[PDB]
């Protein structure tokens, strides 16, 4: 029972877990993008209304 192991591990628990880690990294980068946009808006408003 050997070939089925390699036909099943191509997309198994670890591959799906690593893909979920990829999407987590992506959404964390999106949160970083939101944070930098918000802080830049704060800096702009610190001089456009003070």
């Amino acid at each position: 029972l050997n070939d089925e192991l390699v036909l099943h591990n191509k997309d198994g628990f670890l591959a799906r877990q690593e893909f979920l880690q990829r999407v987590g990294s992506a959404e964390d980068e999106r949160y970083k993008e939101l944070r930098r946009q918000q802080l830049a808006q704060q800096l702009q408003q610190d001089s456009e209304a003070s």
Binding site: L20, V23, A26, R30
Partner: protein
């Protein structure tokens, strides 16, 4: 344990250095073909180009479909795959080219993730507009919901004290049963009481399911999963498959591009395989030129065991492999060689082993000689009747006399043709 002409092919058996051995992966010979097939395997694994065309051509009994199955198996299940036969293109509900495009859009996969929100608990009260009250093992919440699923619950004969399961995203409604807290109310009640669920009524989960573009297109054009009366009442009105406008494909492409750009999905190219493409019409053949020279069309592989033939749909042009030069120019050709005696013997013994049959060496020599005499497929077909004939005499092995008896019992192509030529009334 069903076995049918395949399942002994466990892969190309190619080395990581791109040099194929002699006997491996249930394969013998065809070193050049296997090497080229592995090269194409890495080509598709690159997932960078699109609309590439490869045709492999060779005589019968040369494992062309075996090679296609081998590359499909080597790629694995992550990549989409869809085997096809040329005759399957012709339909009566939609034009042939539209079916070709439909199979094009089913040959590329998309891996997507989304959050599933559900609410499950005990039925407490039903206040019309619609507000519902749910009781969990420890929690309890009241939910306001659309009257559509309220009417669905009414259709679902949900009683008081029951436990239900709701999918918030799709509005899916399903009743688990009734709580065992109020269970032995009747001596022989038909309803099957079920225990109370454990956990909060509100629950969030994650999925990683995969879909193809054709699935998205048909889902957008044809909704076929409704629950309320209006939904299936509408969807039963047009059962016939219709055409799909190209603008729908462009809109779907835009939305999937947005999804992958945002970063919650990625695109997976795939392989489309058409077997016995010699019989395809001229119109489809000239349509392939436009279809391939696109941006999203996946790689395609064709098979044709022909020679100097006229392609179907015309009566003048004689082209190799039944493919006109216009499609040949955008095509890569792989040559398959006929086998020989020792490879035939190895194939026969391997097929016997995968059929868990015991065979004596002289019987293998007789089988190889006969296979060279007539064909490999003939011996492959008739080996199992030899096994049963031996089994009748309560012998687990194969003897030459048994093989000769089976060959006497069952005919081949040449003997049948010779009998037909000298026949009373076209026997």
């Amino acid at each position: 344990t069903r076995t049918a002409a395949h399942t002994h092919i466990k892969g190309l058996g190619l080395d990581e250095s791109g040099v194929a051995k002699r006997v491996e992966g249930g394969f013998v010979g065809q070193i050049e073909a296997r090497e080229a097939c592995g090269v194409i395997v890495d080509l598709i694994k690159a997932k960078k180009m699109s609309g590439r065309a490869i045709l492999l051509a060779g005589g019968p009994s040369t494992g062309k479909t075996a090679l296609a199955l081998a590359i499909s198996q080597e790629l694995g299940p992550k990549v989409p795959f869809c085997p096809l036969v040329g005759s399957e293109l012709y339909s009566v509900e939609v034009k042939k080219t539209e079916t070709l495009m439909e199979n094009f859009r089913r040959a590329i996969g998309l891996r997507i993730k989304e959050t599933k929100e559900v609410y499950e608990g005990e039925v407490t009260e039903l206040t019309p507009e619609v507000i519902v009250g749910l009781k969990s093992a420890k929690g309890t919440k009241t939910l306001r919901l659309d009257p559509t699923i309220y009417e669905s619950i009414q259709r679902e004969k949900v009683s008081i004290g029951d436990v239900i399961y709701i999918e918030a995203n799709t509005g899916a409604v399903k009743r688990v049963g009734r709580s065992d807290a109020y269970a032995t109310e009747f001596d022989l009640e038909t309803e099957e009481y079920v225990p109370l669920p454990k956990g909060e009524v509100h629950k969030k989960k994650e999925i990683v399911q995969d879909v193809t573009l054709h699935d998205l297109d048909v889902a957008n054009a044809r909704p076929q999963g409704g629950q309320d009366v209006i939904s299936m009442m509408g969807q039963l009105l047009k059962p016939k498959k219709t055409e799909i406008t190209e603008k729908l494909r462009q809109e779907v492409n835009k939305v999937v591009a947005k999804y992958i750009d945002q970063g919650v999905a990625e695109l997976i190219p795939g392989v489309l395989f058409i077997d016995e493409v010699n019989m395809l019409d001229i119109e489809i053949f000239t349509y392939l030129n436009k279809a391939l020279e696109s941006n999203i069309a996946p790689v395609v592989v064709l098979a044709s065991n022909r020679g100097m033939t006229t392609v179907r749909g015309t009566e003048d042009v004689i082209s190799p492999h039944g493919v006109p030069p216009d499609l040949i120019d955008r095509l890569l050709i792989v040559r398959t060689l006929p086998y020989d005696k020792d490879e035939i013997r190895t194939i026969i013994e391997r097929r016997a082993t995968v059929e868990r049959l015991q065979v004596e060496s002289s019987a293998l020599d007789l089988l190889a000689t006969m296979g060279t005499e007539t064909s490999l497929r003939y011996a492959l077909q008739l080996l199992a009747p030899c096994g049963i004939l031996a089994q009748t005499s309560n012998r687990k092995e194969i003897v030459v006399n048994d093989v000769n008896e089976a060959k006497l019992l069952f005919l081949d192509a040449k003997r049948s043709t010779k009998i037909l030529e000298t026949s009373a009334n076209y026997l």
